[PDB]
Amino acid sequence: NCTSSSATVHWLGDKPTYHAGVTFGLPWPQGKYRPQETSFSLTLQSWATGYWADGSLKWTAHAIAESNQIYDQYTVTASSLGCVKSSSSSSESSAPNSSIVVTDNSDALTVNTGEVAVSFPKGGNVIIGDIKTKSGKVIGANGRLVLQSQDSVPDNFDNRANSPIQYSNFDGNINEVFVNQTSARTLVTVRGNHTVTDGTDHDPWLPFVVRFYLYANSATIKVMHSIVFDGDENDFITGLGIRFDVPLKGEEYYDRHIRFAGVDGGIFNEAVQGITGLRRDPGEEIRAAQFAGQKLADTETWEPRVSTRLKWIPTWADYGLTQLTADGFGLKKRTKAGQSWVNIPSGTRAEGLAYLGGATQGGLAVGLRDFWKRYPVGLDISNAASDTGELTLWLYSPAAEPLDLRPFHDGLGQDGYEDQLDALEITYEDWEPGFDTPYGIARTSEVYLFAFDQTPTSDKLASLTAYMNDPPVLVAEPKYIHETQALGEYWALPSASPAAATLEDRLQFIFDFYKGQIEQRRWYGFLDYGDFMHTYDPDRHTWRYDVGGYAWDNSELSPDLFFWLYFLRTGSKDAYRFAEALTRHTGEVDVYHIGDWKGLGTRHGVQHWSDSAKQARISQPQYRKYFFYLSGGDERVGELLEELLDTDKTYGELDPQRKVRTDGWEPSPNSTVSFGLGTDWSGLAAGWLIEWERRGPRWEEAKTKLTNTIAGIANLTNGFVTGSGLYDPVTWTLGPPPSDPGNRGNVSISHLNAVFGLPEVVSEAIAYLADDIPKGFKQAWLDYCYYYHASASEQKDRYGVSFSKISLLQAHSRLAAYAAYETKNKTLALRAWKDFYASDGLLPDAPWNITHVDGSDVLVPVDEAAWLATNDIAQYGLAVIQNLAYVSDSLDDYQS
Amino acid sequence: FNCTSSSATVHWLGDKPTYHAGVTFGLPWPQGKYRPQETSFSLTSELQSWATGYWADGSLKWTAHAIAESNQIYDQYTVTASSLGCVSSIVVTDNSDALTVNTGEVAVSFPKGGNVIIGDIKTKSGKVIGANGRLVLQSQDSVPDNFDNRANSPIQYSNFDGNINEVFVNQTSARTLVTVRGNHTVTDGTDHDPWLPFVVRFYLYANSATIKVMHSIVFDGDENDFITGLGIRFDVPLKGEEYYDRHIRFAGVDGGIFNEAVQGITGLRRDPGEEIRAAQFAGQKLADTETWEPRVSTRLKWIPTWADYGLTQLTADGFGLKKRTKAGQSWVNIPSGTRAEGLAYLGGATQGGLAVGLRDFWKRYPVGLDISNAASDTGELTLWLYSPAAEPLDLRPFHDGLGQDGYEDQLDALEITYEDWEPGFDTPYGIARTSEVYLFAFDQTPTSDKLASLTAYMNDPPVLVAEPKYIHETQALGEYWALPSPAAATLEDRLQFIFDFYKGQIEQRRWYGFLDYGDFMHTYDPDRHTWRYDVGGYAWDNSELSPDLFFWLYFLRTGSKDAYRFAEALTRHTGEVDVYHIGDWKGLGTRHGVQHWSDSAKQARISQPQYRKYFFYLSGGDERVGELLEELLDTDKTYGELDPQRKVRTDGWEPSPNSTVSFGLGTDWSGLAAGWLIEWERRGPRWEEAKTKLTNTIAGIANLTNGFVTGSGLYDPVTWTLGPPPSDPGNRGNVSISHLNAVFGLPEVVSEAIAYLADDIPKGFKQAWLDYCYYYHASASEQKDRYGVSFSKISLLQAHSRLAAYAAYETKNKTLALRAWKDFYASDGLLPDAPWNITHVDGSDVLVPVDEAAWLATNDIAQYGLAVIQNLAYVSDSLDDYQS
Numbered sequence A: 001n002c003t004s005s006s007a008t009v010h011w012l013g014d015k016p017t018y019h020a021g022v023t024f025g026l027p028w029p030q031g032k033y034r035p036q037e038t039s040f041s042l043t044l045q046s047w048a049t050g051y052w053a054d055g056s057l058k059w060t061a062h063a064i065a066e067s068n069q070i071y072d073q074y075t076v077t078a079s080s081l082g083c084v085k086s087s088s089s090s091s092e093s094s095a096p097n098s099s100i101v102v103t104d105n106s107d108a109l110t111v112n113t114g115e116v117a118v119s120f121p122k123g124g125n126v127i128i129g130d131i132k133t134k135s136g137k138v139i140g141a142n143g144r145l146v147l148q149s150q151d152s153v154p155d156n157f158d159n160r161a162n163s164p165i166q167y168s169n170f171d172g173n174i175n176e177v178f179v180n181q182t183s184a185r186t187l188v189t190v191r192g193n194h195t196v197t198d199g200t201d202h203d204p205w206l207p208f209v210v211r212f213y214l215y216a217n218s219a220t221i222k223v224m225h226s227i228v229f230d231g232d233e234n235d236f237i238t239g240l241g242i243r244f245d246v247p248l249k250g251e252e253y254y255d256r257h258i259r260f261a262g263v264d265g266g267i268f269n270e271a272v273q274g275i276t277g278l279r280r281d282p283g284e285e286i287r288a289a290q291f292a293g294q295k296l297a298d299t300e301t302w303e304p305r306v307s308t309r310l311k312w313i314p315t316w317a318d319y320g321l322t323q324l325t326a327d328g329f330g331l332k333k334r335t336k337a338g339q340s341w342v343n344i345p346s347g348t349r350a351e352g353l354a355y356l357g358g359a360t361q362g363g364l365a366v367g368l369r370d371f372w373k374r375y376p377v378g379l380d381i382s383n384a385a386s387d388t389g390e391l392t393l394w395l396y397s398p399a400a401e402p403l404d405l406r407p408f409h410d411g412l413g414q415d416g417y418e419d420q421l422d423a424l425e426i427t428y429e430d431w432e433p434g435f436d437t438p439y440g441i442a443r444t445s446e447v448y449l450f451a452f453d454q455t456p457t458s459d460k461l462a463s464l465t466a467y468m469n470d471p472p473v474l475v476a477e478p479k480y481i482h483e484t485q486a487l488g489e490y491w492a493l494p495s496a497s498p499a500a501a502t503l504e505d506r507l508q509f510i511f512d513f514y515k516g517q518i519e520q521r522r523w524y525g526f527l528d529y530g531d532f533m534h535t536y537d538p539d540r541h542t543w544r545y546d547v548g549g550y551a552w553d554n555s556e557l558s559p560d561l562f563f564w565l566y567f568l569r570t571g572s573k574d575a576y577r578f579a580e581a582l583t584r585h586t587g588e589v590d591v592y593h594i595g596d597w598k599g600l601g602t603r604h605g606v607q608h609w610s611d612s613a614k615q616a617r618i619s620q621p622q623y624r625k626y627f628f629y630l631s632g633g634d635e636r637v638g639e640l641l642e643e644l645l646d647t648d649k650t651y652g653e654l655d656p657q658r659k660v661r662t663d664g665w666e667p668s669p670n671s672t673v674s675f676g677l678g679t680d681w682s683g684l685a686a687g688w689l690i691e692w693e694r695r696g697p698r699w700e701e702a703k704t705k706l707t708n709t710i711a712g713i714a715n716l717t718n719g720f721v722t723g724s725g726l727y728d729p730v731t732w733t734l735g736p737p738p739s740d741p742g743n744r745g746n747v748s749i750s751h752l753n754a755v756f757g758l759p760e761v762v763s764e765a766i767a768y769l770a771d772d773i774p775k776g777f778k779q780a781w782l783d784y785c786y787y788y789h790a791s792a793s794e795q796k797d798r799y800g801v802s803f804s805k806i807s808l809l810q811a812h813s814r815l816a817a818y819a820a821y822e823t824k825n826k827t828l829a830l831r832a833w834k835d836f837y838a839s840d841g842l843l844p845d846a847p848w849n850i851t852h853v854d855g856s857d858v859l860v861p862v863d864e865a866a867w868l869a870t871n872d873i874a875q876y877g878l879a880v881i882q883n884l885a886y887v888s889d890s891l892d893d894y895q896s
Numbered sequence B: 001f002n003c004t005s006s007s008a009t010v011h012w013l014g015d016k017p018t019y020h021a022g023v024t025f026g027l028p029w030p031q032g033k034y035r036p037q038e039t040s041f042s043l044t045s046e047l048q049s050w051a052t053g054y055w056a057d058g059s060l061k062w063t064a065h066a067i068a069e070s071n072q073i074y075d076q077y078t079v080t081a082s083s084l085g086c087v088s089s090i091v092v093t094d095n096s097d098a099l100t101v102n103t104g105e106v107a108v109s110f111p112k113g114g115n116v117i118i119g120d121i122k123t124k125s126g127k128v129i130g131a132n133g134r135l136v137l138q139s140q141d142s143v144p145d146n147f148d149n150r151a152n153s154p155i156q157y158s159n160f161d162g163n164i165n166e167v168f169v170n171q172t173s174a175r176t177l178v179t180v181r182g183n184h185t186v187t188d189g190t191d192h193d194p195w196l197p198f199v200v201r202f203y204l205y206a207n208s209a210t211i212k213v214m215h216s217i218v219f220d221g222d223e224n225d226f227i228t229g230l231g232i233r234f235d236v237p238l239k240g241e242e243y244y245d246r247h248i249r250f251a252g253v254d255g256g257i258f259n260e261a262v263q264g265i266t267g268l269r270r271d272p273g274e275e276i277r278a279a280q281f282a283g284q285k286l287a288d289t290e291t292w293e294p295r296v297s298t299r300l301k302w303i304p305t306w307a308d309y310g311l312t313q314l315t316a317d318g319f320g321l322k323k324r325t326k327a328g329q330s331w332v333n334i335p336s337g338t339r340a341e342g343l344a345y346l347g348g349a350t351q352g353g354l355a356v357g358l359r360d361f362w363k364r365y366p367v368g369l370d371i372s373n374a375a376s377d378t379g380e381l382t383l384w385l386y387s388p389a390a391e392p393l394d395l396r397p398f399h400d401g402l403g404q405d406g407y408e409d410q411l412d413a414l415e416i417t418y419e420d421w422e423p424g425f426d427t428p429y430g431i432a433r434t435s436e437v438y439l440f441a442f443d444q445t446p447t448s449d450k451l452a453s454l455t456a457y458m459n460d461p462p463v464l465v466a467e468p469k470y471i472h473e474t475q476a477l478g479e480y481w482a483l484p485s486p487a488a489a490t491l492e493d494r495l496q497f498i499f500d501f502y503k504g505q506i507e508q509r510r511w512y513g514f515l516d517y518g519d520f521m522h523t524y525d526p527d528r529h530t531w532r533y534d535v536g537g538y539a540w541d542n543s544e545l546s547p548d549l550f551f552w553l554y555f556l557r558t559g560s561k562d563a564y565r566f567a568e569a570l571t572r573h574t575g576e577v578d579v580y581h582i583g584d585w586k587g588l589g590t591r592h593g594v595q596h597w598s599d600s601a602k603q604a605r606i607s608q609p610q611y612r613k614y615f616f617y618l619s620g621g622d623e624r625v626g627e628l629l630e631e632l633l634d635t636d637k638t639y640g641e642l643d644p645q646r647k648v649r650t651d652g653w654e655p656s657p658n659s660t661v662s663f664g665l666g667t668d669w670s671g672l673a674a675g676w677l678i679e680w681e682r683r684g685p686r687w688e689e690a691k692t693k694l695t696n697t698i699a700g701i702a703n704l705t706n707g708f709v710t711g712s713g714l715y716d717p718v719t720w721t722l723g724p725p726p727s728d729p730g731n732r733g734n735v736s737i738s739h740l741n742a743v744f745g746l747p748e749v750v751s752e753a754i755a756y757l758a759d760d761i762p763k764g765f766k767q768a769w770l771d772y773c774y775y776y777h778a779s780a781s782e783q784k785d786r787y788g789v790s791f792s793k794i795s796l797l798q799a800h801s802r803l804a805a806y807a808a809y810e811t812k813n814k815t816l817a818l819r820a821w822k823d824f825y826a827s828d829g830l831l832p833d834a835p836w837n838i839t840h841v842d843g844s845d846v847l848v849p850v851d852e853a854a855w856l857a858t859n860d861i862a863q864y865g866l867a868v869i870q871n872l873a874y875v876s877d878s879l880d881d882y883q884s
Ligand SMILES: C[C@@H]1O[C@@H](O)[C@H](O[C@H]2OC(C(=O)O)=C[C@H](O)[C@H]2O)[C@H](O)[C@H]1O
Pocket: A430, A549, A603, A612, A613, A656, A657, A660, A752
């Protein structure tokens, strides 16, 4: 019969002044609503992003049209079909206020929102044919991708004279176009390649996918530009952009307008032909009108000592903003090529929008969210004194030094595994020839496009710049997310214990510090923005940017989980932003999306791809799940989670244990492959569980691999304590390791196995299978949680030997916590808190503060916390979160 | 015989400094008091002295004095001068190849020819710490239209070297000035004739390892010369030094220092030892590897070695920093910042080394610093005055002419943009720029505290100066100003107000850059809230209406550090970039425009050596300024090559070969005369000539019927005489007035000339001057009755009030003094009840927040200030009578 319930969704921070339609997620309790038999209303457009094991809705997405009316909150009421099929009430059926239509043929696809009409060719070298406003007025055309590169690089500036450079230009070439059409929003996904326009023959390269989100009643289009780096040693990217033509034919030069966003809400306001600050005044109204971007009165009405001499007032065709560092931008204009540029008063951080158009012809604004943070970038207006202007956003500026992704070192004469692991001992880098390659990394950039029937106010531009740099987000309530249990059971809301309250303040301290380090230490850049470093250098007073494994962190010890669970518990905007940016880096730049190592990611190093440990614990899709669902099934992360389903194939091309393994095994063709049951498997399982939850094109496969491998672990005599296994890539089964073919019993322990998502995947896995869980899997998992830090005797009693090199006791305290909850054992719960307060990691009497450093010790002033590293704070914070969720009933108890 | 003796005292410019590396200062002396070479000088010991200026009777007018580097630093330095009847040394050594200057702390060798400006730099101990100082330039021959065009418009790079022609030496015991001149000649790359003449000056002081390096260049290129890199470079010998004992430093933001080593031993997985790590960070020789912890010392092979470091400051607001193990590998980006203070060190604990740096680094962007090959036997340390990471320097015109064809069109364009264009006048050919570089030598890597200190020294080099009161008494620097009535107090508060706004707009409008730093703009656009950077004559100011005089006299009266520094910057720009130093137009500067060289009014009122006079003397005869003042002696040649009045003069005259030449008696003549009086004062190579030309043109003007009211004259370039303009062959009388004539130096120059000429002044000149001062803004009656006509096109009445004030003071006339104050307080310029405040502007109106004063422009504030200063010095007694 009838089942209905409601969920409220809030703006992430302050109520916005403007939105351009938004998408959000909502979770639903297990078994409550069936897919396709469930209606949603707002106080609404809807689809499923995930499902529970019995096929009931786990997560949905929802979309709202652009609207002047903006609420403090929004309530979605779900209703089963039963609610309408049981009432005999007549009820009205009307068309929505606004609604998208799409016309679709051989040549091209067109999307009309009511406020713009945009065309997408199905082939060719032009992504957007044109953009019309309501009236039918074309305001921009031939949107296209640009790429520029060079064949080599001089050793230094002096070497230019003796080291010639061959420049090439490329075009975005379309191969496929897709549509996910709905009434309230429509998504055009465009896939392609870059092909040569100018320079020597060059194979097509730099695969792209560009996603356009259009919303009903919106002239604002959001653009997810994703590219994959398939260059070689010889391909140096020089320039990477998005370019539109803006037709100005018909606008008097003095009615053509140029705007750049400046610093903090600022706007640069100029005309192609400037009527202000001349020796003679055409009239106050006329000057005011030009600064306002309005069409000027008829030339007969001006003071005539100006209209007669327009011939003598220069015309400014080209404009260039370049932000080549995180801290300063240049701005210049010129009459036309063959003349010098004139410099313009500039400043620190440009907020990343430019507009070209006119009072009568209309025009177009383009921008990059997070502009200066993703340097080096730029904005160019070109040929604004012609019939056709060009507006270009540069995702990578040619005014920068070229992008060099080659190895930072030659290998220092390391010749083989023995030399490599010896170098591991001093810099923490695990180098190997040919492993230090950026081949297959990706980066996604969030772009916005704004159409205008006419040059808009500067207040409007500033307001859209702010929109672009802080996209409004609607999220469900933490309490609700928790209650549904649709994003794990291992966290909970913030208890009256004064101890618990000092834990909360400590997580807040950790977050605040990590947030400030991003600014202080300038972790900004085209590729770097979003990641942070690993360990600190207390003497130099810097993070170890230049020492092997101590530099970029690359999700080591699961900081992605701490920061995401920290958002879930709290609803903090800063917390969401920190995490979002993290996830946009980690999941794109730190992982390979093509080639033999597709679906692995790279271990922490000096470059994001320098190290030879290529492992699924970096690609670990559990790190993206929380964002996948909260964003409303963000499609690019969507795509990324699918790529990872090919991770299991890697183990035939690469053994992560190749240099340390003692059992003589190597991959060989058509053979069982070796992978770890902790680190690697937790990566695999997470990707399969997610495909299962999504009921995507490989879900039956995913279900089978997960179930079979789970069952395989259950069947190992020592379960998780075994360490690894041999997987069959054809039968999708998991048998014992090469040293234990009879399954007599094997023991191989690693401090790393639990701390890259294992407890999280396993518990979710367990809840998902329910009564179909293979016999003895929960017990094997409990065995590991309990014996990890039981006594040496107890370990020896169960498995034949004590556990040698167990560390990360704080980190693993959460496993005892989990088992304590599940066995209802108070003594075990007390163990969990003891390992938290009185083993390793961050001890409760650690300094727990920042020291300020300045003067001649350091380049710029900095706050430091030398007493911690990222490994510590990630696991400390997970421990806090998970110990509170499982064993807070036992916390006060511990404290007495 | 007699003793004639006196004292003059010299104080630090702002605060007493904590370090100085020798200073040179100036002192004036009263007319007739001391004879050159006969007069002895002592400090509170014997004092390095020499003369920079002389009075007309040959007595000392300005001296210059130098003290050694000393860690004793006093609040005041007192110079006692004594007549003839009263009662730490540098060692230069000559070789065939090369000359060596030794201070007690460094020995630097200068080759006499070749492409190496400096042979080597040794310390007390004799160890070589730097070698092969050399200039680098690199250029390209084309520029692509935009970034897309780079595929279809190849670039040919050319590197170049400083090739030496002449080396001079000015040896004293306290200081030695080595002066090297030359050209830049090809080395690698595409072939090119020699160009970009240089002169580099090296000031060594006794007991200093600091070297001040003034570096000057003339741009003699054309439209196909695009400067790409400009710099100075040294080798640093490292061969004997453990990679872990070689040190890199860069000055960071404010008092910051980046501190690394070529092989880092901090921040590893294993700890070599806490004492050892702190040692590396401090720049000390690390202990023997036998004392280290062997899990580290046995693994040094696997710790990377960092050969190259690059700091690039490509805007005024942001700098990048990065390092590289070696070429073939990617660069590792380093946490950078806003504004790098512009020094870098390369060396070691054992081998010692070298810091180099540029004064005002980030304000003269785009600039940079490079260490290279720091893992080799020999590293290079390079300072870029122009960075190759920036866009090529494009000096070509900003517009194409707009289809202007001849003078009728050019003057029509002038009526709307205030720019006076002409084809081939928008040329940078012959401009210049001086950059103040500093070299510091070290026996071992210094402390970071020490580098931070030398960095701050560099950016604010200690200045000694005379008491303002003393300067005033001597009358050695003009009589048109006096030291600082409620009425006058608000005048002073208002000068402060102007100074604070102008010093502020520098930062707020970001008036920084390799060439731009120093200047400011002319007129504001109140609709856009920008200065009119893009509208013809309203952009860069280029000394229009003598702001140079205002700001310098404002320092004289006050003694303010800020004031000196603002005027110093100004002077290093306008005298260098805003004038031509070679070619047909040499000795002229360029009228205010969008580029510093875009406008076609090439005139001596820009080049006006009076603008540089105060700095020349106060600095102790800054030799670069000396050299520039000598160049302007050829200014009179240009009037045969170029008529500044060509487009506007009614009388049909044109220049012809071997004839007289026409120049104005206000704008042009004021510049010529100042040049002549300065050379005479200096007794330079051409002083007899300068005295003849000054004296003759003065006598010419006195012998003209209507004196200065005659607009112009005819000047003979061979006989050096001055006669009537073309329209009055018989000297019956001509009337031609300009509002510009008095406002570019004329009263300052004349009052100085009248005084300096003494009883030898031509009969009637002083009265011809008093006439102009008196009748400029007299009634139309008094004008018609004196000259036949009334003066048609009078304006700038506030600006001219200071002339009435001169006449009033000199003729003891109270009625005229009251007219002067009336013209100041109630004509034009800046009215007393104008707004006299700034408005803040932010939000979507402007790119960045700014303060504005739309109610003033630079013409107003320069003349307001000169007016205030001069009216107060001449007629402060009539000011109380005026208020009531
Ligand atoms: C077997 C692999 O060996 C190295 O690549 C890495 O191991 C070193 O790094 C870490 C780490 O967490 O990054 C921990 C190990 O103790 C250390 O030997 C990989 O993590 C291993 O998987």
